[model samples]
Target: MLTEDQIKTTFADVAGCDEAKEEVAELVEYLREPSRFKIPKGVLMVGPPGTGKTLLAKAIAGEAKVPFFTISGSDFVEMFVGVGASRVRDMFEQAKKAAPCIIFIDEIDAVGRQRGAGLGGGHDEREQTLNQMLVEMDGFEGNEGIIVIAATNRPDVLDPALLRPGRFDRQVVVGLPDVRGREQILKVHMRRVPLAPDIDAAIIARGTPGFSGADLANLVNEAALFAARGNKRVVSMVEFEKAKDKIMMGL
Candidate 1:
């Protein structure tokens, strides 16, 4: 559990998912005034890896000015029985104390897959943890103000009970950005990098259509490295083009 001071990522820092940003920002309203608005207990974020799923969660905490508790779904699993359940209870207890906060669970499919698929009984640790999660999710009092956000690159593996109205109510797809959003993503990552006056993110975005936000960041970094190797003061368009090719070709 981290306080507001620890989370600095904002919507301005996130890119390639403008639609998801707008939708997720809506929770800030509820966090600010829980009684004035009604919202579902959680949101299920569906997206590929390297997208801004984790960044968006932190941005919510920054925007809402609330505590942020982040954990992976696998963190709930343990070799010993009851540990997962105990951890879930402890997490929720802390969340309740820090009301109007956000709890982000990454890779929820790790623990939320169907309870019984290949066999009659599923994994005991995961089962107990999910049960406790459901109990805590439904245990909220009217607008007590703790919102849960879970992200899974594999969206189809979640259990049905976890998707109930009170659990993860809405689904947001943070798919790869289109042409315009890609340029925006590049510009975002390029904010700190010294760029040559002749460079345009549009040209790079045009060449990279399926890139995720992390890939874009790496592209910018690679461009910077290329510039450094050439002893250039600023990253140039040629360097970016080279980096894109290098990344694409797995060089």
Candidate 2:
């Protein structure tokens, strides 16, 4: 649901599959009429670092023209009992107040880890906080229109209850993009800086087979540095190749 400006200025900078365009359209529709969603549930985005999952979430909210709230799963773990649970309740209340908003919880595995076999783990404060999230997503009584969006690379470690029907209703697998996707991602990054005609994004994408979105972003910055040091007006393929090697070596 990103605006034309957002799509051109920001979203186009990330790496993603062709399916993403359809997903974005579907998300925009769901946001316009929240009640039409299958359930008063949230979406789970699973991907490794720098896969543009977070950016996509922001773009969805922007397209919907709604407020956005974010919380980290690790922050829910506190020293005193019930404190985290209370915070969870407050967080949901605030999101409801900001109705039609997207509530994002990043790195969800920190709080939604599977309940252990033993009785001790279930009784922990963190578990209770997570339980509050489940109940809130399902709602205590009425169905709320608020949409919850949670992200995690390790969905397998999440709790069964959290992943069940009423909580996170859908999962979006945000994995590494294919060859064309990487090329598009690099091309997007290249726009932010001056580049020569010979700097082909497709060839660079092919060269760095395992690179992530963030790595490509870094390469763009490095390419700029190379141009600056060499007294060149624009970055060329030679500079881009050197930058790629520099970043890979640093990694």
Candidate 3:
């Protein structure tokens, strides 16, 4: 299991709940016997930036006790034709050697977008990368322990081949946090700061609408900065709330 310290301390502290815990349990099982789950040829995490996709991927890899590898779909465009293919092969070989490993490809939609469509179908570098990915996931034989867990927000634009029944079978959605989830996230961030009794995390969370985890962390740090500027004893709700307005209206 990924230790609490592996992730930002705040995240691991309050990362308790139905969804995250369940996801971790499933990933643990998969790590034990990856081949048992045929539906999820690979794991796909879809969400916008800052929704904890990367964090969740890392958490999963850590929990599985596996070696981790990552690559961007855009990297394909920088490589030669056969060069990309060779890289893919090398990546898989490395993963196999590591057995029980997790391969995380961020921005997977970049390489697996709907082919033969927008941006000229014929010369799409992302399409070629997706083809290679497909071969590695489903087309490859005897892949029992190496798991590919990819993250992307734009799933609708991805190619069907990548999402086929046998490949990337398990699709996990990492969307914005709910009201309660936001409060939990904020509370997690608050632990790091020297907060006074007046600090109201829920209000801060509500004020920062649609903020990512990183954004939330920044909000707390900024609030602490405001408190320090005045040489306050600790971060107070007044300072935190004021910081929200400062971030919101530039006021």
Candidate 4:
């Protein structure tokens, strides 16, 4: 069970997404103790791929110290009619049973696509799943202690009904990390690895301007692996540079 302080610390460890992180922290704090304010029914995190949206959700669940349910939007869309709706009902039922819990749905665009956008004529399984989602969220109980957090890179395709004020009122956009953010991310990943004094995170951060947190993390891991393969006690600047080249060149 992670407290608000701990969650904020974790958020700091994650590069960029300052606003998104704060919003998630605030939501978690409110949901944990709703006396101060009315709990938000849902929060939707929209961002490009690998922008730490999913990581934010995990941190929120950790901070809330409650049951966390995770499901992909694709999971809700089934071939059989009503199966998707049935699963949606079951998900909410389980969430209500475990009050003060969070339900994270990733790639929500898969199921929440705009109505009538499909090539087919009328309703389909995807639409049914979306309808179920809308209904469950519309009837959400603030006191029931259930909070829904969803992540999607393509929010433009989502149903407007899903984004209305009642359901998923909070929309957070998590973009890529900047240079300083990348440096912080490098520092976070650096804690676990043994590195030589010659390796400067700022230099690496500047070199990789567009790298995401996950990319930096992978770079660090690759650097460590390069050091190990060369039978070195600590990762050096050489290893870091080679790792960067390898990752950038897909070598």
Which structure is stronger by TM-score: 2 or 3? 2
lDDT of 4 by residue, 1-251 (tens): 01122233245445566666776777778657765664688888877766788787766766766666765435224522333667777767766676777777655766666657544324566677667777888887577667788888776667777878878778777777888888878888898788898989999989997787678889999999999999999999999999999998962
Each candidate's lDDT (Cα)? 0.77, 0.70, 0.66, 0.73
For candidate 1, the lDDT comes to: 0.77
Error of 1 at 186 (Å): 1.4
At residue 179, give the lDDT of candidate 1: 86
Q: Which structure among the candidates has the greatest lDDT?
A: 1
Predicted structure with the largest TM-score when compared to the true one: 1
Off by over 4 Å in 4: 1-19, 73-83, 118-123
In model 3, how many backbone clashes occur?
Answer: 5
- Least accurate 10 contiguous residues by lDDT in model 3: 1-10
- Steric overlap count per candidate: 0, 1, 5, 0
Sort by lDDT, best first. 1, 4, 2, 3
Residues 69-161 of candidate 2 have per-residue lDDT tens digits of 775544324422333567788777866776676787755776676656645366577677777788777773323446678888877678777
Candidate 1 per-residue lDDT over residues 69-182, each given as its tens digit: 875435224422333667788878876787888888645776676756745344586687777787888888757778888888765567777888788877878778888988
Better of 3 and 4 by lDDT: 4
Candidate 2 vs 4: which has more lDDT? 4
Q: Candidate 4 clash total?
A: 0
Worst lDDT 10-window in candidate 4: 1-10
